[PDB]
Symmetry: C4
């Protein structure tokens, strides 16, 4: 046949058909027995919608803002590493699609494109940097300074990866970068497949060499002093940690279990979102990622108090289909599904999406 | 073999075997991942029956009334569009079967038979019109006036379809009317497969051109002033909306998720029915559709306070089997299953079907 | 292979392999979609055991009493019709096995052996009669008088079958007695396969002609006056009905959903048992049937207050394997499994099986 | 292929591929329908983890103590009988691996190696004896005295096996020791496959001849007087029994359902653990076995108050793969998974693993 891909799941199925197994598995995988991976999706199904009828939904407006910057929809691209494994244009394709859509891209720290290259490809795109605190704080500071210089509008500091999760397929497949690719923002720090990264997942060994497992809230204080950019804590799952992030002067929480790729057996993000929204008392924006595949997922997250959601894997499946055009397709599908879900539930804009729309 | 069809599921299986895939899929489909479609049936299974013994059930009486009109049983035909796709006689077959059974038919607004043709075929049948408020209010008013003139006894205004739900199979199949058929109560308004209805579901584009997504409770006020016929709000899932319908002088609520074909992830109708019954405080009759396949489904709905239920898909499967005779068969099966369920639970008539008969 | 049957499920599997489909299906079937049939077994699995350690279980005593008559174990044979369809010796085989085991047999009213024949085969066996109130009360009275004369020790009046449940396989199979067999306690009343019993289940038509659907508590008063034998109401699922049975001077409740063959969607018997035990306030013995397959099922029922349980289908599978010897095997397996369950839970006799042994 | 075994489940799959069916089944089996066997694993999945971020996990310390003896990790080898069926070196391989890992081995009473042989093989290993109270108390006392003499540091008295559970596969397979092997701490008491152990499971008959089903708390008093070694009650599932064990001067509870091999339908050990921890009020250490397969299982057990966990079947799968090296592999996998789970949840040592880390 000819691909007729009409929902995000179709893009995944296409991706599985065209990508090398090792690459598909790297993108697909969760940690260990993948309990949380299943739950990120199943949990959305347990939250039921209570639509209002007869509200006038002729002129649905999906626009909102993220950390003070306007976006066309509350659906943004989350950090996924090494996008050139899915399509030759990788992160440059992604940022161009975001520019077209009027939404934001969170650039991953082990991107196969540089901070500068991505800014050059998407100068008008809303762009943020996802950061790890590397053992080498000079590396870390340089990334932040480059993000500042190159027009990025926030730092998302990932806090759930002091070590890499155990993704069994990567170990089985002995996963590594294809030989032509590198992490472009750093030989060892660039994750060269030529370097010695052990006999298991090359990625886990790389993380153990690069990322600082000793970081504490003291290092958050350091990062807060380092930059005036908005900072979002990415990977928070507890209310008490969320309150600590507010106390440290951070500007947002991304409720995330890292796409279920870190600690397996944590709750679904949609299930912990209410706890986190309650804990921060409106003091910072709260975002969600993990398991967003459909317009109704977006609606449910916003009903429970998220400002916006991020999508990880769907973007990679877009790339695998057709680079920039494929990412645009995936974002347009999510946009249209969200528009329809809003309209059928009686919501003419995002400001009227309330907690009475959902019940578990 | 020779078809030996003894329950509603058997009629569906037969229909799948004889109908073109596109047509079967159109009839079968729910929206998106079909979560609500599954739940409309699963939810009935979770409500358990607590039968009373030794009550004298020798003379079971299934008769009741709907909006003041007597019916032989609390089981009525709900609106399903384009019935001539299932059988050459379509809506005329359906109304003749309803006349034979002594129950009512809700005629769909995109029927493949006219309001007048259906009245001529079933002059003695209890008949109601399901209405959409079209952008063209002159079209809308004409339908209501024809229903009045031709002896229809209520208007069911559908309020859950400002836009059509996303039924994936219809998009995959590029669904449209077979070339010989038309919506007979209106070229574009008649959903001619010759007209330009985009490259996706022809139906969704038709709805977007025809149905007014701007309607509000103000338009309900208009409809209430337009006709003295009883008006039922079809597609209500919230208690607050139900109370608003009562406040606007409507005469009934049809608790409906549109056969799970509109917003996916809403609750099953049997699960929201108690909320709606409580909210209206006996001021109007409350009806249910969605997932009724068996006599015990009918019993459970009445135990939870519905006056009557409507069946959608089962009627189409009856048509696909043998037109009028097939619809009669399906209605007789539901009637007999309901009679048996009543008798085995100790209910000699519908007036003694109480809330103590069920527990979730 | 050679049959090595070590649990009740193995006997069912053997039975399916040797019985004609129509006969196996008749025995196996539940009503309609068989929701309750599945639940009778699943519900036992949800009740968890909390065994006591170090109690001294060297000398486990399984003996108890039923309505004042001693039995070797709280596991008795329930009424299953037409046992000669499973084995040439039918009910005579069953009663001989009960005599050997020291347990009781409930003789079914549409038995393929007479009340007298069964008494002659098992003179020392504890025997009870399961009764329906026939439209012909002279038939009914004669059965009771024969039970009295022939040394039967109780009447179990079945109250959940004013009409037969709808067992789909029987309708599909057009089920009837094999030509050589008859209901031996009555041509039409004997369910002769030569007589006209419609085009569906022959059994349903027979029931409609024979059993009185008009019976009320007034007919229970009649039966109570008719005989001084203990009377048990069989098929009660509600506490209020249980209290009424006590008020009418009956001597026991058999909590039963008729093996899930009557109204589908009623609860599992193990789930309603606590309600019934509470409702009767120790005034009569309470028994259970439905889904008993294992020694732990027996233990759970007794923990929740049943005096004894009855088994239906397992006995038929015993017959299908090897008549009397097969029934003895099934009863011995249940006995040994129950003994082991008692011992492993710290119970040296049935008097110390308490409600703290289980939690749902 | 070449075995690439990276998690405990992989070791089981390998074991199934290389072991004779009878032997694999003996090791694998639970009792009866294996409801508890499934639940021991499923229950761990229902307990969700709530990880703390930014805690400094650069120097994770897994060490703890069991009954006053230091161990490298809270993961110890539980008693599994007849280990020479899995590998020629059996219990000697196991103890050598424990010595290498710095963890403890619980030697089973029907070991295929003597108490002395195991001590000689693992002189520096932490070793405990699992004891049954045999009808012959002289046998029983001799085992305890040998454990004392040979440097064993505790007695685990198993209290849930007055009789053996009914493991259906063992009965189907007519299980017995391979001809070259014996229980080395005792012809009949040595479970010689040459002796008469009935026609079912040889093991059940052996247990019935050897183990005293009459034991009570009075026999616990006897054992407590017999030895000054720490004594742990193994197989407790109720809080009241746990309190009795404390009252009798025992030094620990091993919350255990015997790997789901005794009474089927008891709860999962992880589900009863909180009840037991609460009941003993910190007076003795509480341990868990049953269903531990992953590092997150260990973390969940410790969060709910277990001091350490024991693993049964995983060790046997290690042996089946490669004797001592295979056991070492399995223990190292559990160690590393536990280290990662600790780090990703913010725990730098076992003392900070608290109840707020989990919610059901
Ligand atoms: C293939 C892949 C690579 C990822 N790489 C990173 C990364 O480098 N940094 C990071 O913070 N998160 C990373 N994540 C986590 C994502 O930012 C995000 O939390 C996750 O993809 C959301 O779930 P979803 O894939 O279900 O949409 C990655 C996720 C995936 C699937
Ligand atoms: C094939 C099909 C066509 C339908 N067409 C209409 C329609 O034109 N107008 C409307 O109000 N509802 C329509 N509905 C919704 C039905 O009126 C009803 O809510 C639904 O069929 C009930 O669920 P059931 O099919 O499970 O019985 C349609 C449903 C189906 C299945
Ligand atoms: C094949 C079959 C025939 C039965 N016939 C009768 C009957 O004639 N009278 C009656 O009261 N119950 C009858 N029952 C119901 C049984 O007495 C009993 O309630 C049921 O078998 C218990 O469930 P079990 O089969 O799961 O053990 C029958 C059940 C079966 C399976
Ligand atoms: C093959 C096998 C043999 C066992 N033998 C004994 C035994 O001789 N004594 C004993 O107390 N427990 C014995 N057990 C129970 C174990 O000590 C332990 O409770 C169980 O294996 C824990 O569950 P797991 O296998 O899921 O880790 C045995 C368990 C298995 C699987
Ligand atoms: O979830 C993910 O896959 C990830 N998150 N952070 S790094 C990462 S994958 C990775 C990519 C490159 C290198 Cl060198 C190490 C690890
Ligand atoms: O649930 C359903 O299928 C429906 N409900 N209203 S219209 C409809 S299908 C439809 C039929 C004809 C046309 Cl032109 C558009 C749409
Ligand atoms: O559960 C069951 O199968 C039954 N319960 N009562 S009669 C019956 S089956 C039956 C047997 C014989 C006749 Cl004539 C009619 C019906
Ligand atoms: O769970 C288990 O398998 C066991 N627990 N105690 S003995 C045992 S198995 C057993 C081994 C040897 C003998 Cl002789 C009898 C029984």
């Amino acid at each position: 046949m000819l691909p007729r891909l009409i929902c995000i799941n179709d893009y995944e199925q296409h991706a599985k058909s065209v990508l090398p197994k090792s690459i598909y598995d790297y993108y697909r995988s969760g940690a260990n027995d993948e309990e949380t991976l299943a739950d990120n999706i199943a949990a959305f199904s347990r939250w039921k919608l209570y639509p209002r009828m007869l509200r006038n939904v002729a002129e649905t407006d999906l626009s909102t803002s993220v950390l003070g910057q306007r976006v066309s929809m509350p659906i943004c691209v989350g950090a996924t590493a090494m996008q050139r494994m899915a399509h030759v244009d990788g992160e440059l394709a992604t940022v161009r699609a975001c520019q077209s859509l009027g939404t934001g891209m969170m650039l991953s720290s082990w991107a196969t494109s540089s901070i500068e290259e991505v800014a050059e490809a998407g100068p008008e795109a809303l762009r943020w940097l996802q950061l790890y605190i590397y053992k080498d704080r000079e590396v870390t500071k340089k990334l932040v300074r480059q993000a500042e210089k190159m027009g990025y509008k926030a730092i998302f500091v990932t806090v759930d990866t002091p070590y890499l999760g155990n993704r069994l397929d990567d170990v089985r497949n002995r996963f590594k970068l294809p030989p032509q690719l590198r992490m472009k923002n750093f030989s060892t720090l660039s994750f060269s497949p030529e370097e010695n990264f052990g006999d298991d997942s090359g990625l886990a060994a790389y993380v153990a060499k690069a990322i600082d497992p000793s970081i504490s809230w003291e290092d958050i204080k350091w990062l807060r002093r380092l930059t005036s950019l908005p900072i979002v804590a990415k990977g928070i799952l507890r209310g008490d940690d969320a309150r600590e992030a507010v106390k440290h002067g951070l500007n947002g929480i991304l409720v995330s279990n890292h796409g279920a790729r870190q600690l397996d057996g944590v709750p679904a993000t949609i299930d912990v979102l209410p706890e986190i929204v309650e804990a921060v008392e409106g003091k910072v924006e709260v975002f969600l990622d993990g398991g967003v595949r459909k317009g109704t997922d977006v609606l449910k997250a916003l009903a429970l108090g998220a400002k916006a959601v991020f999508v990880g894997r769907p973007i990679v499946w877009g790339l695998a289909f057709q680079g920039e055009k494929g990412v645009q397709d995936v974002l347009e599908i999510l946009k249209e599904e969200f528009r329809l879900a809003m309209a059928l539930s009686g919501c003419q804009n995002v400001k009227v999406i309330d907690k009475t729309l959902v019940r578990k």
